[PDB]
CSV table of C-alpha atoms in Angstrom, one decimal:
chain,number,residue,atom,x,y,z
A,1204,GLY,CA,-17.3,-26.2,10.2
A,1205,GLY,CA,-18.4,-23.4,9.2
A,1206,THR,CA,-17.1,-20.5,7.4
A,1207,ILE,CA,-14.0,-18.5,8.5
A,1208,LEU,CA,-13.1,-15.1,6.4
A,1209,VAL,CA,-10.6,-12.8,7.3
A,1210,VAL,CA,-11.4,-9.5,6.5
A,1211,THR,CA,-8.1,-7.7,5.4
A,1212,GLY,CA,-7.5,-4.0,4.8
A,1213,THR,CA,-5.1,-2.5,1.4
A,1214,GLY,CA,-4.4,0.3,5.0
A,1215,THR,CA,-5.2,1.9,7.4
A,1216,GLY,CA,-8.8,4.1,7.3
A,1217,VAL,CA,-10.3,2.7,4.2
A,1218,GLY,CA,-13.4,1.7,5.5
A,1219,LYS,CA,-12.4,-2.3,7.4
A,1220,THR,CA,-14.7,-2.2,10.4
A,1221,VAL,CA,-17.9,-1.0,8.4
A,1222,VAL,CA,-16.9,-4.0,5.7
A,1223,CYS,CA,-17.4,-6.2,8.2
A,1224,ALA,CA,-20.4,-5.0,10.4
A,1225,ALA,CA,-21.4,-4.4,6.3
A,1226,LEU,CA,-20.9,-8.2,5.2
A,1227,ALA,CA,-21.7,-9.5,9.0
A,1228,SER,CA,-25.4,-7.5,8.3
A,1229,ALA,CA,-25.9,-8.4,5.1
A,1230,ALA,CA,-25.3,-12.2,6.3
A,1231,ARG,CA,-27.5,-12.1,8.8
A,1232,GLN,CA,-30.7,-10.8,7.0
A,1233,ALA,CA,-29.6,-13.3,5.2
A,1234,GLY,CA,-30.4,-15.8,7.9
A,1235,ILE,CA,-26.5,-16.8,8.6
A,1236,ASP,CA,-25.1,-16.7,11.6
A,1237,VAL,CA,-22.1,-13.9,12.5
A,1238,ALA,CA,-19.3,-13.7,14.8
A,1239,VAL,CA,-16.5,-11.0,14.7
A,1240,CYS,CA,-13.3,-11.6,15.5
A,1241,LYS,CA,-11.0,-8.3,16.0
A,1242,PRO,CA,-7.9,-10.4,18.2
A,1243,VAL,CA,-6.3,-7.3,18.3
A,1244,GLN,CA,-7.3,-3.2,18.3
A,1245,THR,CA,-5.6,-0.4,18.7
A,1246,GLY,CA,-6.3,3.3,19.3
A,1247,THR,CA,-8.6,2.5,22.4
A,1248,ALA,CA,-7.8,5.7,24.4
A,1249,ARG,CA,-9.8,8.1,21.9
A,1250,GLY,CA,-12.9,5.6,21.6
A,1251,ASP,CA,-11.8,3.0,19.0
A,1252,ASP,CA,-13.8,0.0,19.9
A,1253,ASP,CA,-14.0,-1.4,16.6
A,1254,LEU,CA,-16.6,-4.6,17.3
A,1255,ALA,CA,-18.2,-1.8,19.1
A,1256,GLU,CA,-19.2,-0.9,15.9
A,1257,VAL,CA,-20.2,-3.8,14.7
A,1258,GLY,CA,-22.3,-4.8,16.8
A,1259,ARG,CA,-24.2,-1.3,16.8
A,1260,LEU,CA,-24.2,-1.3,13.2
A,1261,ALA,CA,-24.5,-4.7,12.6
A,1262,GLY,CA,-26.2,-6.1,15.8
A,1263,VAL,CA,-23.3,-8.4,16.1
A,1264,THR,CA,-22.9,-10.3,19.7
A,1265,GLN,CA,-19.8,-12.7,18.8
A,1266,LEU,CA,-17.8,-10.3,19.5
A,1267,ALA,CA,-14.5,-11.5,20.4
A,1268,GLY,CA,-11.1,-10.1,20.6
A,1269,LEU,CA,-7.6,-10.7,23.1
A,1270,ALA,CA,-6.1,-7.8,23.0
A,1271,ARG,CA,-5.8,-4.1,23.4
A,1272,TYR,CA,-4.1,-1.1,23.2
A,1273,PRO,CA,-4.2,2.8,23.7
A,1274,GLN,CA,-1.9,4.5,21.4
A,1275,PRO,CA,-3.0,4.9,17.7
A,1276,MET,CA,-0.5,3.0,16.7
A,1277,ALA,CA,0.3,-0.2,14.2
A,1278,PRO,CA,-0.6,-3.6,16.9
A,1279,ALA,CA,3.5,-3.8,17.1
A,1280,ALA,CA,4.5,-0.5,18.0
A,1281,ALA,CA,1.6,0.7,20.2
A,1282,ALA,CA,2.5,-2.8,22.3
A,1283,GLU,CA,5.8,-1.4,22.2
A,1284,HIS,CA,4.9,2.0,23.6
A,1285,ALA,CA,2.9,0.2,26.4
A,1286,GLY,CA,5.7,-2.0,27.1
A,1287,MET,CA,3.5,-4.7,26.7
A,1288,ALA,CA,3.3,-8.3,24.4
A,1289,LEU,CA,1.2,-8.9,22.0
A,1290,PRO,CA,-0.9,-12.0,22.1
A,1291,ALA,CA,0.8,-15.2,20.7
A,1292,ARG,CA,-0.1,-16.7,17.3
A,1293,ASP,CA,-2.2,-19.7,18.8
A,1294,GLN,CA,-4.1,-17.7,21.3
A,1295,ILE,CA,-5.4,-15.5,17.6
A,1296,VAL,CA,-5.5,-19.1,16.4
A,1297,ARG,CA,-7.5,-20.8,18.6
A,1298,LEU,CA,-9.7,-18.2,19.2
A,1299,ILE,CA,-10.9,-17.9,15.9
A,1300,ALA,CA,-11.2,-22.2,15.4
A,1301,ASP,CA,-12.8,-22.2,18.5
A,1302,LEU,CA,-15.8,-19.2,17.5
A,1303,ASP,CA,-15.9,-21.8,14.1
A,1304,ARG,CA,-19.2,-24.0,13.7
A,1305,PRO,CA,-21.9,-25.0,10.9
A,1306,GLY,CA,-24.3,-22.2,9.4
A,1307,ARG,CA,-21.8,-19.1,10.8
A,1308,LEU,CA,-19.8,-16.7,9.0
A,1309,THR,CA,-16.8,-16.1,11.5
A,1310,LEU,CA,-15.2,-12.8,10.2
A,1311,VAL,CA,-11.7,-12.0,11.5
A,1312,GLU,CA,-10.6,-8.4,11.0
A,1313,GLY,CA,-7.2,-7.3,10.8
A,1314,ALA,CA,-5.8,-4.2,12.9
A,1315,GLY,CA,-4.5,-2.3,9.2
A,1316,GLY,CA,-3.3,-4.2,6.4
A,1317,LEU,CA,-2.1,-7.5,5.9
A,1318,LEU,CA,1.1,-7.8,6.6
A,1319,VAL,CA,1.0,-5.3,10.0
A,1320,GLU,CA,2.3,-7.5,13.1
A,1321,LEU,CA,-0.3,-9.1,14.6
A,1322,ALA,CA,0.9,-11.8,17.6
A,1323,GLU,CA,4.4,-12.8,18.3
A,1324,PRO,CA,7.0,-13.2,16.6
A,1325,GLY,CA,6.2,-11.8,13.4
A,1326,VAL,CA,2.9,-13.3,12.6
A,1327,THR,CA,0.3,-12.2,9.9
A,1328,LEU,CA,-3.5,-12.0,9.6
A,1329,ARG,CA,-2.0,-13.4,6.6
A,1330,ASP,CA,-0.5,-16.3,8.5
A,1331,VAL,CA,-3.4,-17.2,10.5
A,1332,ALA,CA,-5.4,-17.1,7.8
A,1333,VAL,CA,-3.5,-20.4,6.7
A,1334,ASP,CA,-3.8,-21.3,9.5
A,1335,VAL,CA,-7.0,-21.7,10.1
A,1336,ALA,CA,-7.3,-21.6,6.4
A,1337,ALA,CA,-9.5,-19.1,5.5
A,1338,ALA,CA,-9.9,-16.6,2.6
A,1339,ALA,CA,-9.8,-13.2,2.4
A,1340,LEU,CA,-12.1,-10.5,1.8
A,1341,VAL,CA,-10.0,-6.8,0.6
A,1342,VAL,CA,-11.2,-4.4,2.1
A,1343,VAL,CA,-10.2,-1.3,-1.2
A,1344,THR,CA,-10.4,2.4,-1.8
A,1345,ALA,CA,-11.7,3.3,-4.4
A,1346,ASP,CA,-8.8,6.8,-4.7
A,1347,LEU,CA,-5.6,6.9,-6.8
A,1348,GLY,CA,-3.0,4.1,-5.4
A,1349,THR,CA,-5.5,1.8,-4.8
A,1350,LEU,CA,-4.5,-0.1,-8.0
A,1351,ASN,CA,-1.2,-0.7,-6.6
A,1352,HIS,CA,-2.3,-1.5,-3.3
A,1353,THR,CA,-4.8,-4.1,-4.3
A,1354,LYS,CA,-2.1,-6.0,-6.4
A,1355,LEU,CA,0.5,-5.6,-4.1
A,1356,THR,CA,-2.0,-6.9,-0.8
A,1357,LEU,CA,-3.4,-9.9,-4.1
A,1358,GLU,CA,0.1,-10.9,-5.0
A,1359,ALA,CA,0.9,-11.2,-0.9
A,1360,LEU,CA,-2.0,-13.4,-0.6
A,1361,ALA,CA,-1.1,-15.3,-3.1
A,1362,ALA,CA,2.4,-16.4,-2.6
A,1363,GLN,CA,1.4,-18.5,0.3
A,1364,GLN,CA,-2.0,-19.8,-1.2
A,1365,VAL,CA,-4.7,-17.7,0.7
A,1366,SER,CA,-7.2,-17.4,-1.4
A,1367,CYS,CA,-9.0,-13.5,-2.3
A,1368,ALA,CA,-12.7,-14.3,-1.9
A,1369,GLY,CA,-12.2,-10.6,-3.4
A,1370,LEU,CA,-12.6,-7.1,-2.9
A,1371,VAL,CA,-14.6,-4.1,-0.7
A,1372,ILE,CA,-14.5,-0.8,-2.2
A,1373,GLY,CA,-15.0,1.0,1.4
A,1374,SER,CA,-16.4,4.1,0.6
A,1375,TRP,CA,-17.8,5.0,-2.6
A,1376,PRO,CA,-18.1,8.9,-3.0
A,1377,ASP,CA,-20.7,11.1,-4.3
A,1378,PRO,CA,-20.5,11.8,-7.1
A,1379,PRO,CA,-17.9,9.3,-7.9
A,1380,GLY,CA,-15.7,11.2,-9.5
A,1381,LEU,CA,-13.3,10.1,-12.7
A,1382,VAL,CA,-10.6,8.4,-11.4
A,1383,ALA,CA,-13.0,6.6,-9.1
A,1384,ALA,CA,-14.8,5.7,-11.5
A,1385,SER,CA,-12.0,4.3,-13.3
A,1386,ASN,CA,-10.6,2.6,-10.2
A,1387,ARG,CA,-14.1,1.1,-10.0
A,1388,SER,CA,-13.3,-1.1,-13.7
A,1389,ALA,CA,-10.0,-1.5,-13.5
A,1390,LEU,CA,-10.4,-2.9,-9.8
A,1391,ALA,CA,-13.4,-5.6,-10.9
A,1392,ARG,CA,-10.5,-6.2,-14.0
A,1393,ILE,CA,-8.1,-8.1,-11.3
A,1394,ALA,CA,-10.6,-9.1,-9.2
A,1395,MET,CA,-15.0,-9.6,-8.3
A,1396,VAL,CA,-16.4,-6.5,-6.4
A,1397,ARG,CA,-18.3,-8.0,-3.9
A,1398,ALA,CA,-19.1,-4.3,-2.6
A,1399,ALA,CA,-19.1,-0.8,-3.0
A,1400,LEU,CA,-19.9,0.7,0.7
A,1401,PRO,CA,-21.7,4.2,-0.5
A,1402,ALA,CA,-19.7,6.8,1.5
A,1403,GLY,CA,-20.7,8.2,4.5
A,1404,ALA,CA,-22.6,4.9,6.0
A,1405,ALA,CA,-21.3,4.7,9.3
A,1406,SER,CA,-23.3,7.7,10.2
A,1407,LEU,CA,-26.2,5.3,9.4
A,1408,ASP,CA,-28.4,4.2,11.8
A,1409,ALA,CA,-28.8,0.4,12.5
A,1410,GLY,CA,-32.0,-0.3,10.6
A,1411,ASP,CA,-30.4,2.0,7.5
A,1412,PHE,CA,-27.2,0.8,7.6
A,1413,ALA,CA,-28.9,-2.6,7.6
A,1414,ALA,CA,-30.6,-1.4,4.2
A,1415,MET,CA,-28.0,-0.6,3.4
A,1416,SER,CA,-25.6,-3.5,3.6
A,1417,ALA,CA,-28.5,-6.1,2.2
A,1418,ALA,CA,-28.3,-3.6,-1.2
A,1419,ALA,CA,-24.5,-3.6,-1.3
A,1420,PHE,CA,-23.9,-7.6,-1.8
A,1421,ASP,CA,-25.2,-9.8,-4.1
A,1422,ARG,CA,-28.0,-11.9,-2.3
A,1423,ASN,CA,-26.9,-15.2,-3.3
A,1424,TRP,CA,-23.0,-14.8,-3.0
A,1425,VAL,CA,-24.0,-13.6,0.4
A,1426,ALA,CA,-25.9,-17.0,1.5
A,1427,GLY,CA,-22.8,-19.1,0.2
A,1428,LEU,CA,-20.7,-18.3,2.3
A,1429,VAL,CA,-22.3,-20.2,4.6
B,128,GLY,CA,27.5,-0.3,-17.6
B,129,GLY,CA,26.5,1.7,-14.6
B,130,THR,CA,24.3,2.3,-12.0
B,131,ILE,CA,20.3,1.9,-12.6
B,132,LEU,CA,18.3,2.7,-9.4
B,133,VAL,CA,14.6,2.3,-10.2
B,134,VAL,CA,13.3,5.1,-7.9
B,135,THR,CA,9.6,3.3,-7.0
B,136,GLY,CA,7.5,4.5,-4.1
B,137,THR,CA,5.3,2.0,-1.4
B,138,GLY,CA,1.9,4.3,-3.3
B,139,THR,CA,2.0,7.7,-5.2
B,140,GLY,CA,2.2,11.4,-3.4
B,141,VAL,CA,4.7,9.4,-1.6
B,142,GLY,CA,7.2,12.2,-2.4
B,143,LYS,CA,9.4,10.2,-4.6
B,144,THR,CA,10.4,12.5,-7.4
B,145,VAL,CA,11.8,14.7,-5.2
B,146,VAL,CA,13.8,11.6,-3.6
B,147,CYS,CA,15.4,11.6,-6.8
B,148,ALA,CA,16.6,14.8,-6.7
B,149,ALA,CA,17.8,14.7,-3.7
B,150,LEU,CA,19.5,11.9,-4.5
B,151,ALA,CA,20.8,12.9,-8.0
B,152,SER,CA,21.9,16.1,-6.1
B,153,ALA,CA,23.6,14.3,-3.4
B,154,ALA,CA,25.4,12.3,-6.3
B,155,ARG,CA,26.0,14.8,-8.8
B,156,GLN,CA,27.7,16.6,-5.3
B,157,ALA,CA,30.1,13.4,-5.4
B,158,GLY,CA,31.4,14.0,-8.8
B,159,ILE,CA,28.7,11.1,-10.1
B,160,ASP,CA,27.2,12.1,-13.3
B,161,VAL,CA,23.9,11.1,-13.3
B,162,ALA,CA,21.0,10.8,-15.2
B,163,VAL,CA,16.9,11.0,-14.3
B,164,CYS,CA,14.4,8.6,-16.7
B,165,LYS,CA,10.9,8.7,-16.1
B,166,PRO,CA,9.0,6.2,-18.8
B,167,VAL,CA,5.4,7.0,-18.1
B,168,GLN,CA,4.1,10.5,-16.7
B,169,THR,CA,1.1,11.4,-16.4
B,170,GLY,CA,-1.6,15.1,-15.4
B,171,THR,CA,0.4,16.7,-17.8
B,172,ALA,CA,-2.6,18.7,-18.5
B,173,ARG,CA,-2.1,19.8,-14.8
B,174,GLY,CA,1.6,20.8,-14.9
B,175,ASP,CA,2.9,17.6,-14.0
B,176,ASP,CA,6.2,17.6,-15.0
B,177,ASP,CA,8.4,15.2,-12.8
B,178,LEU,CA,11.4,15.1,-15.2
B,179,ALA,CA,10.8,19.2,-14.9
B,180,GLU,CA,10.7,19.4,-11.2
B,181,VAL,CA,14.0,16.9,-10.8
B,182,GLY,CA,16.0,19.6,-13.2
B,183,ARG,CA,14.7,22.5,-11.4
B,184,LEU,CA,15.4,20.4,-8.4
B,185,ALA,CA,19.1,19.4,-8.5
B,186,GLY,CA,20.0,20.6,-11.9
B,187,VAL,CA,19.8,17.4,-13.8
B,188,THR,CA,20.1,18.4,-17.1
B,189,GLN,CA,20.5,14.5,-18.7
B,190,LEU,CA,16.6,13.8,-17.9
B,191,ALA,CA,14.8,11.2,-20.1
B,192,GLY,CA,11.0,10.9,-20.9
B,193,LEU,CA,8.4,9.3,-23.0
B,194,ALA,CA,5.2,8.7,-22.5
B,195,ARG,CA,3.1,12.0,-21.6
B,196,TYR,CA,-1.1,11.7,-20.4
B,197,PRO,CA,-3.2,14.9,-19.7
B,198,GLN,CA,-5.6,13.5,-16.7
B,199,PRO,CA,-3.8,12.9,-13.5
B,200,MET,CA,-4.3,9.1,-13.2
B,201,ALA,CA,-3.1,5.6,-13.1
B,202,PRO,CA,-1.3,5.6,-16.7
B,203,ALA,CA,-3.4,2.8,-18.1
B,204,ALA,CA,-6.5,5.6,-17.7
B,205,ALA,CA,-4.8,8.6,-18.7
B,206,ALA,CA,-4.0,6.6,-21.5
B,207,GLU,CA,-7.7,5.3,-22.3
B,208,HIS,CA,-8.8,8.8,-21.8
B,209,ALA,CA,-6.4,10.6,-24.0
B,210,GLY,CA,-7.1,8.0,-26.7
B,211,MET,CA,-3.6,7.3,-26.2
B,212,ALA,CA,-2.1,4.1,-26.0
B,213,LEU,CA,0.9,2.5,-22.9
B,214,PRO,CA,4.1,2.1,-24.1
B,215,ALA,CA,5.6,-0.7,-24.9
B,216,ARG,CA,7.8,-3.2,-22.1
B,217,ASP,CA,10.3,-3.2,-25.0
B,218,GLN,CA,10.1,1.1,-25.3
B,219,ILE,CA,10.5,1.8,-21.6
B,220,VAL,CA,13.4,-1.2,-21.7
B,221,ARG,CA,15.6,0.9,-24.8
B,222,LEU,CA,14.5,4.5,-22.8
B,223,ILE,CA,16.5,3.3,-19.8
B,224,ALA,CA,19.5,1.6,-21.9
B,225,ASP,CA,20.3,4.1,-24.1
B,226,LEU,CA,21.1,6.4,-20.9
B,227,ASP,CA,23.2,3.2,-19.4
B,228,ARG,CA,26.8,4.5,-19.1
B,229,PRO,CA,29.9,3.6,-16.4
B,230,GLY,CA,30.2,6.2,-13.8
B,231,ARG,CA,26.6,7.3,-14.5
B,232,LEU,CA,23.6,6.8,-12.0
B,233,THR,CA,20.4,6.4,-14.0
B,234,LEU,CA,17.4,7.3,-12.1
B,235,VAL,CA,13.8,5.3,-13.3
B,236,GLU,CA,11.2,7.2,-11.6
B,237,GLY,CA,7.9,5.3,-11.3
B,238,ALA,CA,4.4,6.2,-12.0
B,239,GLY,CA,2.8,5.5,-9.3
B,240,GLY,CA,3.5,2.3,-6.9
B,241,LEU,CA,5.7,-0.6,-7.5
B,242,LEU,CA,2.7,-2.3,-9.8
B,243,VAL,CA,1.2,0.3,-11.8
B,244,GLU,CA,0.9,-0.4,-15.4
B,245,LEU,CA,3.3,0.3,-17.3
B,246,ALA,CA,2.6,-0.9,-20.6
B,247,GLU,CA,1.1,-3.9,-21.2
B,248,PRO,CA,0.1,-6.4,-20.5
B,249,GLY,CA,0.8,-5.5,-16.3
B,250,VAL,CA,4.0,-5.1,-17.4
B,251,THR,CA,5.4,-2.8,-13.8
B,252,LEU,CA,8.0,-0.5,-12.9
B,253,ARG,CA,9.3,-4.4,-11.2
B,254,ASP,CA,9.6,-5.9,-14.6
B,255,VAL,CA,11.7,-3.1,-16.1
B,256,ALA,CA,13.8,-4.1,-12.8
B,257,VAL,CA,14.5,-6.9,-14.3
B,258,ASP,CA,14.8,-6.4,-17.9
B,259,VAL,CA,17.6,-4.1,-16.8
B,260,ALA,CA,19.4,-5.8,-13.6
B,261,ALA,CA,18.1,-2.4,-11.6
B,262,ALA,CA,17.8,-1.9,-7.8
B,263,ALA,CA,14.7,-0.7,-6.5
B,264,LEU,CA,15.0,2.0,-4.0
B,265,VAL,CA,11.8,2.3,-2.9
B,266,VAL,CA,10.6,5.5,-1.5
B,267,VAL,CA,7.8,5.8,2.0
B,268,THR,CA,6.2,7.8,4.2
B,269,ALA,CA,6.6,8.0,8.1
B,270,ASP,CA,2.6,7.6,8.6
B,271,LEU,CA,0.4,4.9,9.9
B,272,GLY,CA,0.3,2.5,7.5
B,273,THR,CA,3.7,2.5,6.2
B,274,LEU,CA,5.0,-0.4,7.5
B,275,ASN,CA,2.3,-2.6,6.0
B,276,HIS,CA,3.0,-1.0,1.8
B,277,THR,CA,7.1,-0.8,2.8
B,278,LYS,CA,6.7,-4.7,3.6
B,279,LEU,CA,3.5,-5.6,0.5
B,280,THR,CA,6.4,-3.6,-1.5
B,281,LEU,CA,9.7,-4.8,-0.3
B,282,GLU,CA,8.3,-8.3,-0.5
B,283,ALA,CA,6.8,-7.1,-4.2
B,284,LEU,CA,10.8,-7.0,-5.3
B,285,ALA,CA,12.2,-10.1,-3.4
B,286,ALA,CA,9.2,-12.1,-5.4
B,287,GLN,CA,11.1,-11.0,-8.5
B,288,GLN,CA,14.1,-11.3,-7.3
B,289,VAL,CA,14.5,-7.5,-7.5
B,290,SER,CA,17.3,-6.5,-5.1
B,291,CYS,CA,16.5,-3.3,-2.5
B,292,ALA,CA,18.8,-1.0,-2.3
B,293,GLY,CA,16.8,0.1,0.6
B,294,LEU,CA,14.3,3.2,1.5
B,295,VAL,CA,13.9,6.7,1.5
B,296,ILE,CA,11.5,8.4,4.4
B,297,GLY,CA,10.0,10.8,1.6
B,298,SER,CA,9.0,13.8,4.2
B,299,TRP,CA,9.9,13.5,8.3
B,300,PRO,CA,8.7,16.4,10.4
B,301,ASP,CA,10.2,18.4,12.3
B,302,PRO,CA,9.9,17.4,15.2
B,303,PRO,CA,8.4,14.1,14.8
B,304,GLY,CA,5.4,12.3,15.9
B,305,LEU,CA,5.4,9.4,18.2
B,306,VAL,CA,4.2,7.2,15.2
B,307,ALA,CA,6.6,8.6,13.2
B,308,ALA,CA,9.7,8.2,15.5
B,309,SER,CA,8.2,5.1,15.7
B,310,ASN,CA,7.3,4.0,12.3
B,311,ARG,CA,11.6,4.9,11.5
B,312,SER,CA,12.6,2.7,13.3
B,313,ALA,CA,10.7,-0.5,12.3
B,314,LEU,CA,11.1,1.0,8.7
B,315,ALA,CA,14.9,0.5,9.3
B,316,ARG,CA,15.0,-2.7,10.9
B,317,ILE,CA,12.7,-3.5,7.0
B,318,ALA,CA,15.9,-2.7,5.0
B,319,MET,CA,18.3,0.3,5.3
B,320,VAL,CA,16.6,3.8,5.6
B,321,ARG,CA,18.9,5.8,3.7
B,322,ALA,CA,17.7,9.3,4.1
B,323,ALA,CA,14.2,10.5,5.4
B,324,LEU,CA,14.3,14.3,3.5
B,325,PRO,CA,13.3,16.1,6.1
B,326,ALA,CA,9.5,18.0,6.0
B,327,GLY,CA,9.2,20.6,2.7
B,328,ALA,CA,12.5,19.9,1.0
B,329,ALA,CA,10.3,20.5,-2.1
B,330,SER,CA,10.1,24.2,-1.4
B,331,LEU,CA,14.6,25.0,-0.8
B,332,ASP,CA,16.2,27.4,-3.4
B,333,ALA,CA,18.8,25.0,-5.3
B,334,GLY,CA,21.3,26.7,-2.5
B,335,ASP,CA,19.3,24.7,0.2
B,336,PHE,CA,18.0,21.1,-1.2
B,337,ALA,CA,21.8,21.2,-2.9
B,338,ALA,CA,22.4,21.0,1.0
B,339,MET,CA,20.0,19.2,2.1
B,340,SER,CA,20.9,17.0,-0.4
B,341,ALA,CA,24.1,16.1,1.6
B,342,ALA,CA,22.8,16.3,4.6
B,343,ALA,CA,20.4,13.4,4.2
B,344,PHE,CA,22.3,10.7,3.2
B,345,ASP,CA,25.5,8.8,4.0
B,346,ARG,CA,28.7,10.0,1.7
B,347,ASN,CA,29.7,6.7,1.7
B,348,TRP,CA,26.7,4.9,0.1
B,349,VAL,CA,26.2,7.4,-1.8
B,350,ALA,CA,29.6,7.4,-3.5
B,351,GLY,CA,29.5,3.6,-3.5
B,352,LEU,CA,26.4,3.3,-5.8
B,353,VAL,CA,29.1,3.8,-9.3
B,354,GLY,CA,32.6,2.7,-9.5
């Protein structure tokens, strides 16, 4: 094997994709080979291709996905509106397991949060984490409500002995703010904050984004993932 | 004793307080004596006062607070900023037990979401629900992300064997989007949806708000909340 990391979020719109790109870019600059698997993509009718994002921002070429739905909804719901099933649990696990190879960091991006249905029946990114024995990196916000949402997510992780790889603040505001400031301390009292991605990092060009990414994560932690 | 519900939410800003007032109104219109409790209230320096809002909206007069903090932050961080400490778990529990009385529905409104620290160390509303054998009513949104947030909250309730009294959609749009209609149907498969309060329910005078509250819930279920 190499290392398989599931990247989940406490909710939607928390910067998960750009965190996957950022971790991917940091890891590549450390010489680690990186693949990203986004099994289920939604909101595609309005352009959303998160794998393309990762490719543009981090230069990953091993970008694997099974299903794209047009509606900007949860996978299960976008499928319902499309009249088409979700992929199967085996499809998602086999695809990920086949991506994984010595020396490669395989990132597994979820859709929305940890417990959103990814495959039939009712199987989540948490289920997939168990099947492939992956730790979970949790993308969190710095806003009010993040501690409840983070504590909820890590509880859900721990109920199935899914290890928490740490937290990444998806968007760090400038200037921080009192709440943001306080949450960043509170967050690190309950897990390792691997990174706080500066607000606006999604807009950077590739070279800037790689400079940002390499500076946002601890060098030793990244290279230690494989 | 009586019936004690804790009223929590999947997050902050999902409409908890307006849901207490709406349930409070519906139960008082049912001839049920209602008390509303708010052990930790932050944002007082902003004018935040959820006990007062509940009374203003549902005419509930039995209103019980305990901890008040100026900054609109999580209780722990509001405490630290004001130089104060959070109450203790037994202080919160004491405040609730003192209101519990047969034929009375005591609502315990949380600060933020279920796992918001209310007391040291890491004591949450979930623990307080255990201590007083309360069910949780969970206030949700119709917005995307809600199914995940709701499953996490019910999962955390069940992990401590706190019964889920059900869900209330804090704000229900008129008319509802494809995302809102989808989530509501999906939410109703997770747990019973006791009410979906119309959007802007907080801007109703006492008359319109009482008529909304009475329409929002099932009479049967409200009446059945307390013997």
